[PDB]
Design a protein around this ligand. Structure first.
Ligand SMILES: CCCCC/C=C/C/C=C/CCCCCCCC(=O)OC[C@H](COP(=O)([O-])OCC[N+](C)(C)C)OC(=O)CCCCCCC/C=C/C/C=C/CCCCC
Ligand SMILES: O=C(O)COc1ccc(Cl)cc1Cl
Lengths: 320, 320
């Protein structure tokens, strides 16, 4: 672990905190944004920035050149996490479905796009970049849509066939689903027939997509200024939010990798990626749907602080 | 002229119209955003994105390698538009000072920060970038401050030290002022001593500044949707606002360019930049001070529509 490699991690993490700070200061000390305005900014982030980012992620990779072992391992990890959460909730802590979503939003949705590429590139070779790209594409194609479907189903519940039909009806109009579908279609078209996206469309998409992550962090800092303080999540809930993200998710990912027989850099990069801090998109969704938005906030705040400790610990463990 | 050039300009301009149309549809038709949410988004873009973009543009300029001929041309463009507005108003339309500010907020304040770099950097490549950034620096450092002082003087007119003090107090709480000062200082340091911005700070600034143009157009579209109609005022003061920007301003700028003997790209760019539609800061000042906010809004809304039609015309004309 070269000392100059810690500089890379810190440089990848600090910018995601500068915007968050700016937002917190604007909301609390400057009293610049009212709660309605913060909700509107978050809605813009969730409706225009995230769909375009997902489209770009999905439309810039080879759908037919993708490690199937990586896909199977990710699916197995997600299924195992869902099963474990369902089993635990049955005996621990009504409103059980609301906690299954809040578990997947802090367990099986890392932030490999921002904090993953630099950390893995510094600690591993170029192949890790491709593996992380594939993981991000999968989580922005399948998992980010399944999470939205679950959110819609939870909102509708607040006779079963009617609820499912309502959830599907509300999902089909969601920008994220259409963005993902168009992204996959364009990816296959461009990588089979060689079609290239016209410049007037690529630039238009980039203009809105660009700066979306800064806006998401701004919204995260804005929402954290309307809570009790910085750990409004609580004391025990904040402690378990990290055992779910750095002690259970990584273990289940290791189990999935063992089951799928991963033996390559597709192992030391497939497991380490699962120990990275939480993403911002899960918060962007959990605050628009108002499903425990305080639990996926302190987790984000305190996950990028311990990213380096836990990541280096897992790196040492894998080598041993 | 070749159709390829016309197509290049159209492609450069299309994304900035797609963002505006998306914002307008989201506000009015799709009804994603409530008026409070739209106001919050406008405040965010005007407080965090625009100042950072201004700082970046200013820092990407060389104070010691400016063009004094361009400086003089820009100062004489806004000094004989005053001598043409103080003479016409003598024989046309009490409120000479009020109308002069409204006449200056239209003719000689192009939007060279949001809609000037993209279009012109594409029409003439990267050569025009230096000229546009120099003009942006000048209008952010001198002309906006003078406009603020004139607005304060008009407000107090319906001693001088009190007006200057009020202008200074209101100028210190403006993010644009701090952004411009810091950008000038950093450009001086970088281009004299050779210092380089740290990677962390650069990435943090880019996180928010990247989306400062697409989101600016989105906010413009939201504002257009907020207004009741395109032509808020009457035709009498609507067919004159366009002629005060696409006929009088460019003509008086061509006169300045001939007096100062500007030649080459510094001419085809120095006149073309004056034909761009009006900015939004003058509208903000007019709304805050309530100085004819129904004409400065009409101009800003009806120039964004016919910018490309009236920009291709000047592009074709100047080639001869
Ligand atoms: C050197 C750092 C100077 C920091 C300047 C801050 C000074 C603090 C000001 C104190 C005066 C008290 C009044 C403060 C109000 C302005 C706040 C502000 O101005 O806050 C930054 C601004 C956002 O203000 P606001 O709109 O949110 O609220 C302000 C509007 N109202 C008042 C309505 C809420 O917008 C921005 O982000 C500005 C972005 C451009 C500045 C980027 C600085 C980068 C640093 C460059 C220098 C680097 C040198 C190399 C050295 C490297 C090693 C260290
Ligand atoms: O540069 C300009 O004159 C216009 O750019 C803007 C566009 C939208 C908003 Cl809110 C603020 C600004 Cl300054």
């Amino acid at each position: 672990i070269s000392w100059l490699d810690i500089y890379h991690v810190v440089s990848a993490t600090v910018p995601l905190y500068v915007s968050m700070t700016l937002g917190f200061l604007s909301a609390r000390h400057l009293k610049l944004f009212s709660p309605e305005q913060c909700a509107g900014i978050n809605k813009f982030v969730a409706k225009f920035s995230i769909p375009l980012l997902s489209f770009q992620i999905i439309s810039e990779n080879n759908p037919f050149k993708m490690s199937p072992k990586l896909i199977l391992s990710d699916i197995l990890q997600k299924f195992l996490v869902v099963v474990v959460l369902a089993m635990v909730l049955r005996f621990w802590h009504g409103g059980k479905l609301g906690w299954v979503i809040t578990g997947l939003s802090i367990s099986v949705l890392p932030n490999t796009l921002i904090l993953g590429m630099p950390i893995l590139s510094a600690i591993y070779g170029d192949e890790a970049a491709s593996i992380l790209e594939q993981i991000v594409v999968l989580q922005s194609l399948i998992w980010y849509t399944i999470l939205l479907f679950l959110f819609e189903l939870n909102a509708a519940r607040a006779g079963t066939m009617k609820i499912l039909l309502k959830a599907w009806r509300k999902l089909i109009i969601n920008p994220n689903t259409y963005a993902t579908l168009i992204g996959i279609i364009w990816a296959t078209l461009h990588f089979r027939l060689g079609w290239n996206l016209p410049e007037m469309i690529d630039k238009s998409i980039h203009l809105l997509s660009d700066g979306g992550l800064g806006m998401a962090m701004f919204s995260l800092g804005l929402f954290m200024a309307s809570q009790s303080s910085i750990i409004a999540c609580g004391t025990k809930m904040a402690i378990i939010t990290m055992l779910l993200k750095f002690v259970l998710g990584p273990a289940l990912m290791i189990a999935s990798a063992y089951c799928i027989r991963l033996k390559s850099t597709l192992f030391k990069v497939a497991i380490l990626q699962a120990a990275l801090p939480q993403g911002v998109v899960p918060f962007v969704f959990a605050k628009e749907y108002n499903l425990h938005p305080e639990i996926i906030s302190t987790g984000v705040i305190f996950g990028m602080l311990i990213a380096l400790p836990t990541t280096l610990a897992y790196y040492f463990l894998l080598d041993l």
